[PDB]
């Protein structure tokens, strides 16, 4: 047991009518709900990253509120902006100075969503979406006076002006709304099993479970839940996990680049998990503590299993077995049991069977010419050359990967719905909106109401395009394009007003396809592999023409291979039919 | 129009330490039966100096003493009369308007409007039984007005204390976390319906109209989301009420 301190990252568990952790829906949705079926304290949910909150102290928003009110006088506006910036800097300085101070009962604290980086707030001028009599709670990127939340004891043992201890139920009262947060039983129609959270008088209590301590939250030391990359020095290659032939496999991918450090892929990102007595406690890993490795995209954990070398490295779905456990033997001297510093050479050891990890040149994908996947077995003895270096990862990559994974999930759901031969109007609207956000993300242009069908991007983002290619988002787009026709929709019937939303959906999909292959050979080839299906839609008002023309004209080889008498004849026929200069 | 806390305190202490001589409550089964018999014999009305009048006056005095959002007197008042006896006497098939008024006022000023949280109220079916009786009284008023013959005392009871208690129960900070609301949706819906019908009558006065509108607004606000929806036939007039309130 320990006292609560400002800056600690803890998990909130609802107690009362509905029991569960606070989670946030997919995409940029700011709604906060509770999923009792997702998991419990004994068995935390698999997507536990969404149930982590950081405690922050009082933040002043008077200048920011005044500036926002004024915006909704150029010199006055500039002065207000300067005042808001100064207030933000002062708040940051205060947070830095007061960091680590103990939290006292009856004080004012704020909850920040680490995954979303949005402060929870209660809006006093609008009601909740479902429970009209209740009051709405939402996540705001910048926050407001609603972020302030008094903390009060739930039992009679404690009183005002007392230290807060881990594993205790507390009541959060907004300063403005002044109503304890309630996990309303009202189920969300959009997502089954999700219970909305609002602000209304009730008896619900939020248990506080400590996960990461302010002292152990230092970025200079490796901590559980942090994502990094493991690099091999001798092989000059990166470890990765991918679905080679329908089965997930872990391999040391070979790179033909002239700079090994630049051979970075999202699927090669790994996360470190610390083992503690409390399953929900991660803390910071010590040099004498057990460690686990997790895949930031597939979610499987690294492990070693009997090799058909005696043991080979693979990925497992759950970490509830000693196989996933691993230890990091330092290559150099260490400060006794001090926390592991980030970006330090280490050697992986498998304690389940007491075998030492090693690297071998035997490919795992010998079936394909010039294999890239390389086997990573284990040796009974220890080799000093098998040292893996840690590389940090910016938060932008994590955010992009999470968004891509969520979008791929919804696109797979949409493809399944389309293949079923029936899609609801609401589902179609959701799919169209998702394609809109995907177009905006690929174009990397702010959403200002401009016609996305004619959106113009000055400089393509190579990292985003690589993320789309490797995450199979383009495959999902192709499946969406091919599903209605395969029926649900027909090319000849697109002219009818009924299928107009479907026409716009195909339009958005083709825009996505065009925007992911701008001056990128790999994406261009990946899309061109479906040249037959792309040409099958030629002529119809879907703008397959512009995408095909751009893709094939950007590359000489693709134009030489693909264009033939048939394509020219089709173009001549369609221009005769329409007689348009385009 | 002001409350003397010290006078209330001394009155409460004097009544408690005086004994059963000054305060008489028909909480016992035999005492409850005697109260029932005397109430039945008083169908025409309540006599000026009958023991029923004394009991009603005592209950009113206790309710007034408990008023003022205090803690010294309210705890003792609640201890003297538990909710079970209030439900037993008020919910009995046979009753009189004056006793209902007195007990409802006592509940409102000693249980619903308590300054200190009490778990036994918002975690029991006593007040829900009370609310079903309130709905029954509203239906009785509506039926009586259907025949153009109604008792003014019953209308006053439904208008003055019934609405106040309903508003207090659904407008207190400690009631925002009621755990039995979801299982008791129907009753609250019924209440809303009843209130709507009571507002549909033309004889309602301007002050009564405003009070009923405020009560309906509070009920709707508490009825926004509780895993419940407003029936379309019932919502037909609720939409107009909301439009008028917005104006
Ligand atoms: O400079 P170019 O002509 O584009 O060629 C690059 C490189 O030579 C490889 O083809 C490939 O790396 P891998 O062999 O490691 O896949 C990379 O794609 P990538 O960004 O998808 O790695 C290409 O962009």
- Chain A interface, best mutation among B112, B225, B226, by max A CB count within 10 A: B225
DSSP letters spanning A10-30: EEEEEESSS-EEEEE-STT--
Measure in Å the smallest separation between the Cα of B170 and chain A Cα atoms: 10
Is there a contact between A331 and A387 (Cβ–Cβ < 8 Å)?
yes
Chain B residues with beta carbon closer than 8 angstroms to that of A185: 182, 226-227
Question: 């004024």: which residue's tokens?
Answer: A70
Of B184, B206, B182, B208, residue with least CA distance to B195 = B208
Question: 């970025």: which residue's tokens?
Answer: A219
d(CA B124, CA B169): 13
d(CA A120, CA A117): 10
Test B224 with A127 for CB contact under 8 angstroms: yes
CA B112 vs. chain centroid, Å, equals 9
User: Gap positions in chain A, given as the residue before each gap (C–N > 2.5 A)?
Assistant: 72, 308, 486
Of A190, A194, A196, A178, residue with least CA distance to A130 = A196
Q: CA-CA distances (angstroms) from residue A107 to A147, A148, A390? A: 13, 10, 40
CA A82 vs. chain centroid, Å, equals 33
Give, using CA atoms, the residue closest to atom 18 of ligand 1: A522
Of A280, A148, A174, A209, residue with least CA distance to A13 = A209
DSSP letters spanning A397-410: HHHHHHHHHHHHHH
Other C-beta atoms closer than 10 Å to the C-beta of B196 total: 19
Other C-beta atoms closer than 10 Å to the C-beta of A360 total: 14
Test A132 with B224 for CB contact under 8 angstroms: yes
| Residue of A261, A468, A521, A557 to test ligand 1 pocket, by largest number of atoms within 8 Å of CB | A521
Which H or E run includes A480?
helix A473-482
Q: Please, which residues have CB within 8 angstroms of residue B16's CB and are 6 or more apart in sequence?
A: B23, B76, B80
Q: CA-CA distances (angstroms) from residue A7 to A184, A200, A262, A286, A395? A: 28, 27, 34, 21, 19
Burial A412-423 (b: 16+ CB within 10 A, else e): eebbebbeeeeb
d(CA A424, CA A430): 10
Q: Are strands A226-232 and A205-212 parallel, antiparallel or unpaired?
A: unpaired
d(CA A30, CA A541): 36
Angle between helices A500-515 and A425-443 (to 10 degrees): 20
Burial A117-144 (b: 16+ CB within 10 A, else e): ebbbbbbbeebbbbbbbbbbbbbeeebb
Is there a contact between A334 and A289 (Cβ–Cβ < 8 Å)?
no
Compute φ and ψ for B5, nearest 5 degrees. -60, -45
Q: Where are the alpha helices (DSSP H) in A103-254?
A: none
- Structure tokens that stand for A389 in this block: 């270096």
d(CA B34, CA B25): 11
- Structure tokens that stand for A498 in this block: 């009924």
Question: 């979303």: which residue's tokens?
Answer: A116
Test A202 with B224 for CB contact under 8 angstroms: no
B117 touches chain A (CB under 8 A): no
Is there a contact between B127 and B121 (Cβ–Cβ < 8 Å)?
yes
Q: CA-CA distances (angstroms) from residue A517 to A263, A436, A460, A512? A: 20, 17, 9, 9
d(CA A57, CA A108): 7
C-alpha radius of gyration, chain B, whole number: 19
Is there a contact between A134 and A140 (Cβ–Cβ < 8 Å)?
no
Annotated binding site of A: 253, 255-257, 462, 466, 469, 520-522
Locate the chain A residue with the closest alpha carbon to B228.
A186
Test B173 with A132 for CB contact under 8 angstroms: no
d(CA A417, CA A406): 17
d(CA A90, CA A95): 9
Q: Can you state the percent helix, strand and coil of chain B, rounding each to 5?
A: 70, 0, 30
Test B177 with A200 for CB contact under 8 angstroms: yes
Q: Is A522 in the pocket of ligand 1 (CB under 6 A)?
A: yes
Expressed in angstroms and rounded, the spacing between residue A481 Cα and the centre of ligand 1 is 27
Which H or E run includes B15?
helix B5-18
Burial A379-390 (b: 16+ CB within 10 A, else e): beeeeeebbbeb
Of B100, B192, B106, B110, residue with least CA distance to B155 = B100
| A vs B: CB pairs below 8 A | 63
Chain B residues with beta carbon closer than 8 angstroms to that of A132: 220-221, 223-225
DSSP letters spanning B161-194: IIHHHHHHHTS-GGGTT-SSTTTTHHHHHHHHHH
d(CA A134, CA A181): 10
- Structure tokens that stand for A556 in this block: 């000489």
Give, using CA atoms, the residue closest to atom 2 of ligand 1: A521
Other C-beta atoms closer than 10 Å to the C-beta of A267 total: 18
Locate the chain A residue with the closest alpha carbon to B222.
A133
Q: Please, which residues have CB within 8 angstroms of residue A126's CB and are 6 or more apart in sequence?
A: A136
A470 touches chain B (CB under 8 A): no
Angle between helices A462-470 and A521-528 (to 10 degrees): 40
Chain A residues with beta carbon closer than 8 angstroms to that of B176: 179-180, 182, 200-202
Instruction: Assign B102 to helix, strand or coil.
Output: helix
- Structure tokens that stand for A42 in this block: 């004994």
d(CA A267, CA A296): 7
d(CA A435, CA A508): 6
Measure in Å the smallest separation between the Cα of B66 and chain A Cα atoms: 23
The torsion of the CA quartet A510, A512, A516, A521, rounded to 10 degrees, works out to: -10
Compute φ and ψ for A175, nearest 5 degrees. -65, -45
Of A324, A304, A322, residue with least CA distance to A314 = A304
Locate the chain B residue with the closest alpha carbon to A129.
B225
Test B176 with A132 for CB contact under 8 angstroms: no
Q: What residues pair up with A453 in beta bridges, in sequence order?
A: none
C-alpha radius of gyration, chain A, whole number: 27
- Structure tokens that stand for B26 in this block: 């028909």
d(CA B91, CA B68): 27
Angle at B111 between CA B101 and CA B142, to 5 degrees: 35
Of B207, B180, B67, B59, residue with least CA distance to B125 = B180
d(CA A174, CA A186): 21
A154 touches chain B (CB under 8 A): no
- Structure tokens that stand for A532 in this block: 């037959």
- Structure tokens that stand for B141 in this block: 């008023």
Chain B residues with beta carbon closer than 8 angstroms to that of A133: 220-226
The torsion of the CA quartet A133, A139, A144, A148, rounded to 10 degrees, works out to: 70
Instruction: Please name the residues between 156 and 215 in chain B that touch chain A, using a CB distance below 8 Å.
Output: 172-179, 182
């Amino acid at each position: 047991s320990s006292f609560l301190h400002i800056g600690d990252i803890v998990s909130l568990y609802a107690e009362g009518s509905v029991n569960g952790f606070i989670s946030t829906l997919g995409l940029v949705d700011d709604r906060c709900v509770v999923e009792p079926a997702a998991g419990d304290l004994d068995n935390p949910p698999k997507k536990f990253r969404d149930c982590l909150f950081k405690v922050c102290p009082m933040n002043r928003y008077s200048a920011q509120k005044q500036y926002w009110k004024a915006k909704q006088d150029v010199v006055l506006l500039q002065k207000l902006q300067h005042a808001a910036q100064m207030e933000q800097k002062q708040n940051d300085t205060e947070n830095k100075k007061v960091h680590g101070d103990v939290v006292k009962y009856g004080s004012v604290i704020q909850l920040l969503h680490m995954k979303s980086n949005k402060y929870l707030t209660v809006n006093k001028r609008l009601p909740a979406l479902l429970e009209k009599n209740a009051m709405r709670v939402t996540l705001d990127a910048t926050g407001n006076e609603g972020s302030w939340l008094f903390i009060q004891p739930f039992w009679k043992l404690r009183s005002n002006g007392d230290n807060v201890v881990v594993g205790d139920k507390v009541i959060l009262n907004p300063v403005n709304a002044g109503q304890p947060l309630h996990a309303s039983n009202y189920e969300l129609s959009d997502n089954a099993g999700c219970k909305e959270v609002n602000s209304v008088n009730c008896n619900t209590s939020w248990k506080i479970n400590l996960f990461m301590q302010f002292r152990d939250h230092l970025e200079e030391v490796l901590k559980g839940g942090d994502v990094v990359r493991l690099f091999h020095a001798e092989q000059e290659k990166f470890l990765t996990c991918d679905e080679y032939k329908g089965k997930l496999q872990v391999f040391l991918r070979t790179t033909l680049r002239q700079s090994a450090t630049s051979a970075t892929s999202s699927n090669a990102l790994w996360e470190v998990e610390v083992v503690h007595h409390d399953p929900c406690r991660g803390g910071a890993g010590h040099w004498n503590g057990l460690y686990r490795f997790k895949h930031l995209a597939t979610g499987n954990y690294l492990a070693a299993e009997e090799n058909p070398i005696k043991y080979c490295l693979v990925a497992v779905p759950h970490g509830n077995d000693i196989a996933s456990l691993f230890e990091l033997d330092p290559t150099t001297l260490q400060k006794t049991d001090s926390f592991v510093p980030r970006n330090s050479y280490v050697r992986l050891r498998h304690l389940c069977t007491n075998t030492w990890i090693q690297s071998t040149n035997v490919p795992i994908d010998i079936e394909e010419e010039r294999p890239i996947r390389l086997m990573l077995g284990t040796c009974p003895t220890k080799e000093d050359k098998e040292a893996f270096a840690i590389v940090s990862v910016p938060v932008s990559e994590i955010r992009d990967l999470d968004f891509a994974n969520d979008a791929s999930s919804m696109l797979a759901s949409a493809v399944e719905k389309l293949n079923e031969g029936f899609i609801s109007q609401n589902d179609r609207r959701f799919v169209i909106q998702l394609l809109e956000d995907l177009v905006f993300f690929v174009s990397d242009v702010p959403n200002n109401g401009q016609n996305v069908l004619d959106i113009m991007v000055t400089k393509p983002n190579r990292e985003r395009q690589k993320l789309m290619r490797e995450q199979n988002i383009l495959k999902q787009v192709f499946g969406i394009l091919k599903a209605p026709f395969r029926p649900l929709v027909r090319l000849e019937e697109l002219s009818d007003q009924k299928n107009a939303p479907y026409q716009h959906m195909f339009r958005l999909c083709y825009r996505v396809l065009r925007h992911s292959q701008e001056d990128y050979r790999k994406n261009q080839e990946h899309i061109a592999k479906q040249f037959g299906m792309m040409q099958s839609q030629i002529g119809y008002d879907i703008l397959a023409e512009d995408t095909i023309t751009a893709l094939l004209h950007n590359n000489r080889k693709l134009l030489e291979k693909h264009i033939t008498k048939t394509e020219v004849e089709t173009f001549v026929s369609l221009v005769r039919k329409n007689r348009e200069p385009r | 129009g002001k409350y003397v806390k010290k006078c209330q305190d001394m009155i409460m202490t004097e009544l408690t330490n005086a004994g059963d001589d000054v305060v008489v409550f028909y909480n016992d089964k035999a005492s409850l039966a005697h109260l029932l018999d005397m109430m039945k014999a008083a169908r025409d009305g309540v006599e000026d100096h009958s023991p029923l009048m004394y009991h009603i006056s005592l209950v009113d005095l206790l309710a007034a003493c408990a008023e003022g959002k205090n803690v010294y007197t309210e705890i003792k008042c609640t201890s003297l009369l538990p909710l079970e006896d209030v439900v037993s006497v008020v919910t009995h098939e046979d009753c009189i308007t004056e006793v209902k008024m007195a007990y409802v006022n006592f509940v409102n000023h000693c249980y619903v409007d308590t300054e200190v949280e009490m778990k036994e109220i918002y975690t029991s079916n006593h007040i829900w039984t009370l609310f079903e009786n309130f709905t029954l009284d509203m239906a009785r008023v509506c039926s009586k007005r259907e025949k153009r013959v109604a008792d003014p005392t019953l209308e006053k009871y439904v208008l003055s204390v019934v609405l106040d208690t309903i508003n207090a129960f659904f407008s207190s900070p400690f009631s925002e976390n009621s755990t039995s609301l979801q299982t008791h949706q129907t009753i609250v819906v019924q209440l809303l319906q009843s209130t709507t019908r009571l507002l549909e009558c033309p004889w309602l006065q301007q002050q009564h109209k405003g009070s009923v509108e405020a009560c309906i607004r509070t009920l709707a606000m508490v009825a926004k989301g509780r895993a419940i929806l407003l029936p379309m036939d019932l919502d037909a007039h609720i939409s107009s009420m909301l439009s008028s309130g917005a104006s």
